[model samples]
Target: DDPLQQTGQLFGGLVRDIRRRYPYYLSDITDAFSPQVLAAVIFIYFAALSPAITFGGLLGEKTRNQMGVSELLISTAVQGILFALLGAQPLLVVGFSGPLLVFEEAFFSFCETNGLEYIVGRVWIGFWLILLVVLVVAFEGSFLVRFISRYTQEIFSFLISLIFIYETFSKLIKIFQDHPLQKTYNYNVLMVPKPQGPLPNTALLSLVLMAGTFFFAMMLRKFKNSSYFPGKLRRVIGDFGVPISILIMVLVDFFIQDTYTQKLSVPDGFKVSNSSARGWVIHPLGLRSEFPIWMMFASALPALLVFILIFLESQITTLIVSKPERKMVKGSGFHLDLLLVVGMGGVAALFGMPWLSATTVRSVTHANALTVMGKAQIQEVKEQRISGLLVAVLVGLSILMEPILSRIPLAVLFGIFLYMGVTSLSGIQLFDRILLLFKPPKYHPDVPYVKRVKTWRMHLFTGIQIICLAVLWVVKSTPASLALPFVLILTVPLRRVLLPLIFRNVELQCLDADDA
Candidate 1:
């Protein structure tokens, strides 16, 4: 009679198939060969590599006690609806958190500067980002993202990694600053400091976590633990190493906090405030203030840029996934729904939440998991529920069980970021574009397409991405007058013209000619 009862039957079927495919029951196997073995191994690996935590002083027991379960549920529900309803892929799950946590620090600062509440700030920004997506879809801007050379994508991702690195190191340094280790020979003790911003210790923690996840995932490919793992352990580790890695890191950060300080000290170049003058700050907009005609316009440029990046990344992934004898189908649509969700998300975020996106790694994982050799169609609707459940459960845990979630170090999370960026390189075409600058011409295959300007096009694309990245970093940090996207736009047209000169061959009569 229960809904879960029906789902349980399907789950049972799933298990049966696994057993039929992989022989040797769990109870009979050596512990090392078991699912629990792999999971335990992975968990331990991250635990040791994770960053030192000192969160006790920053987030108090009082706050945890006062936490509102109902509000948290409502917020999570809002995200679930967006993911379930709006996402392009039906099976893709949407939930409360991801890399958006990185944006939270800046977003919160903006809210304070504008004298607006956290909730209000999130809602406003969510709406703004949504509008930006809508404009992109309406204008067919998503398609344009492909024109961006592989070099551009690589450069942008590199810059983002730098930011992650900076934030991580900053946190670790702050930990050291607050809780300097007292050197007395017999196991020096740390003077736990208040972790403000990204500490060096936390950054290292995130990096270690990220590395562990990558290595474990790699090992799983060969190990393939169906017959080896028992019960729930197999399902958890076998199919979800990346997500599990995330879990391990969170626990690490939470456990490592300084009980003595009872507060995390803010690190250099990283302040919790949003005064606009200190560190990185974002001024929030007033809630009660009358809405202006074009208030959301400010978010448009950045949102458009984000869409371009997402589109480029997702499309490239699809190309590679399909390249092996061309099996995977090209994905599209749910545009209007995407707009609605993002728009609504912006509204919700304005009230103090994180921005969401059509992430790449999870999408790819879902694709492979659902892959049926004979049945090519990727189940859209059903998978959404699965993924939704995945995120919902994690977010729910984050809210209800703060102590458990806080232990995850930033190092582990960085591993996830690195994996996403690196795996994107599987497609030789994209990777080639980046390495073209460093790789000699001999390695490149001769192709009729773009044959004329093959040489020139390489450097041009690389320059565009490099320049745009530099401009963005400068704008964010120093007194840069021009915004980034605008600068990128200017560079695009020039690239279109200069490409041919680099590849023009004497054998070809005309530069843009049909054939000799």
Candidate 2:
């Protein structure tokens, strides 16, 4: 009888809360103005930017047979600024997700097989996806929250953490496997080939740059715990560690005159977007007439599927970021941020840009980059507009910073990525918790889960999570990997139905506890 009034009262309470908590927001902004904070943001921007272009280029080539490098950088810059200024959860770093890339590639192949223009299909898909996301926010917000449990969150978090670590290690190995330095030489006087034995000077130089940058960043990170340094000074040094290591390595390479080391191949002379002739703003609905109405409607099915994929990706990332363990002060707004993604996704689609979602690796990196630590644990997270300002800088650099980016050796950036990937592992409890199963009881992790849950039960729980994670990983690495999101959804049921049958309720509760 009083539905509208109840809704009004609910909103009124929110307004009162915001008014009362105004200082928190102001303080975040004020703190963001500091030099160390600025340096930290710049460091994370580069950490994120390198992967953005690399993955974007790969996805574009596989799906559209075009280069998406510029599109990726420009879209990341735009969305970063938008979310920074207007997003409800400022800590969520929006970028391309692996699942979405797989879905888009499949969608493109499907359209091509049916003799339809992939771009037109994509426009329709993105439009429908936005509408679906908006409808979910308006009607099903609470229902969505009720569906996820601590079990689901932990499994997803574990999967993403492993992804970051595995991807970093794989790319690091590829750098050496595909070492660009010359292998051997042919002598004019002799029939036998001359052996360029032992690792080439170029190879040694590459290894040094990569290893030096990685170790330097790690050592600087540990400096925060150094008894020799003052508190504030240690924090500043640790905060700027990645960028400082990168800068020092670049200088080292330049003086060494080791031109053989692979450098970042950022394109020369930036244009507004990928298609310079079309300019920045594009008409998304311009090609709608080319396809039949029924076909356009059919695209909605895949669009719904795409929305589900993104929903899981974004919400899971948000859950991990907002975990109570991180001790974030401002808290998370999953509903509001999901809606923001819908708007951003539509805008990106208009320009034929990649769809943006809450990227787990980058979001975790962003959160940890701003974290205040106490020895091994994070004491608190200092959220701010750091992501927005840093990405905005990228927008400017899109037109101006190619030469500088090009000069920095690719190995140095990989090292920064390696550092981010490794450092983020501290937050993933599943990995460490599972490892304790192999250790003697004396060496077991001193945690509630291990202390309370029976050894066999804990093994059963961790085993199920590993199976789910393994399936998702295999799918994500396969040709039919667009089904990755569907597999992720199964973990929810497995946690709710399958695991309870295997273990006692108390044991399940201990394993799934939010705080642990």
Candidate 3:
């Protein structure tokens, strides 16, 4: 009973946040039942529906590649607890996620090539970050990150966000390729095999679902557009954000599954066993000592830059989530935040889970919930409090829920992942600012944020960031020569003079140390 009550409170917190953000939605609810009831219903619904979606998509793709609902839920739930219970920003739901999947996979593959397991290598990365966090706290790390200029910050944020763009556009394109519209009217019987499981084939259903979820989530941010939807349904959709894409995908899969294929047989590699679910063992930093000092330093180059990048991204999210306007119910533990990150790497090394970051969703989500009316406009607190207690209870009891959680289909997870990729791009601050790039005496933020200023340094940094992303894309698609992209990402500063010609949205954050 207590578990259920806490669950209700946790959900309530989330709903409350969403309601505050979209006060317009509150008009739709009549009973004011409880956020817990709402959360439980959605949680169960997603858990039940996830597997079918994942199985269908994976069967269709015939690759052991697609992310499933089980993975997403488990990962998201794990991180969600961290934010809910311990984080300064409980509105932020931490979880399985984001473009880092590719990099995480890369780390895993590197380990395998070098005879490392997922858990072991992840631990190494964790320790590295842990050390960094210690240094940050010891010497006031935020102050160090404070010195990183706007050009670097913008470039980092832009590039980090670009990972979403690249992944989202690519999936969108893939969905298009799978659409039935490509048929040439030639009369030979098309030997198309039936797609397996409860998932819909990657056609109009998947594409529309993906596109619509993305569109509605952004629009719904305003909250007023939902005035027309049926009251109860409207509140539910708002709480899930873009995650509804996965639910839609599952329904499409279930109703539309082809009868011809034998019940989509989940392949061996695809199924999650207790062993596989155990995730990482070693830490990311531990791997450092294994490599030659020079080579490890080379690796650390990206790790260091990324570490700084992580600090910027994480701290910025914390700041936004903590601010009164966002209505965070609690304050995040900066030191603990670093420890969690370090722990994530360690978890990956030991268990094979992916490297985790301060998820934008969790951060924003935490802030969204728990925000209440204050003396002047909406104000926020520093900790999750009641929400955190609820989360801790859920986490403690999560073991019992694993069986149910595991049933969630992979296709649903894929859909969730797909929508996540799309939703992440909703916050592009400087996109319109590009028009004023040539302005001078820019208003700079302590977070190394960029504004409408165009200088040689800015230009150079922008060029390098874009070029590195472009190169990373090419290298991601092109195998064997992947190191080339890494080299380019690292070396953009060497060719600074020509940068002004190539880029215009230049800022101080764009440039690395030497340029700094």
TM-score for every candidate vs. truth? 0.52, 0.88, 0.53
Which prediction has more favorable lDDT, 1 or 2?
2
Candidate 3 lDDT over residue span 1-516, tens digit each: 110012222233323333343333222233224553344334333332332334334322321332333343344445545544444333444433333444555555665676543444344454466566555554434433333333333444445455655654665565445444554422433445533222234455555554554555555434523465786666555555444544554455556544111122222342333333242233334433453343334445435544654554565555444433343322234445555554554343344333445655434433333333332355433332344334434533444555544433333443444444443433333432343355553654423334344455554444455665566556545653325323433433433445445544344324332222
The local lDDT score (0 to 100) that residue 345 gets in candidate 2 is 81
The superposed Cα distance between candidate 1 and the true structure at residue 386, in angstroms, equals 2.3
Instruction: Report the C-alpha lDDT of model 1 over 170-206, residue by residue, as the tens digit.
Output: 6545545554544332223443433332223433444
113, model 1: CA deviation in Å? 7.0
Which stretches of candidate 3 lie above 4 Å from their native place? 1-83, 96-132, 148-155, 158-162, 176-202, 211-313, 323-332, 351-355, 365-428, 435-516
Q: Please, what are the lDDT tens digits per residue for candidate 2 over residues 203-290?
A: 5677788889999989887776787578778777777888789889999998876245666655445553335334455555444345
Clashing residue pairs, candidate 2? none
Residue 173 displacement (Å), model 2: 3.7
Worst 10 residues of 1 by lDDT: 1-10
Instruction: List candidate 1 segments past 4 Å from native.
Output: 1-77, 90-182, 185-327, 349-355, 359-385, 401-417, 428-430, 436-482, 498-516
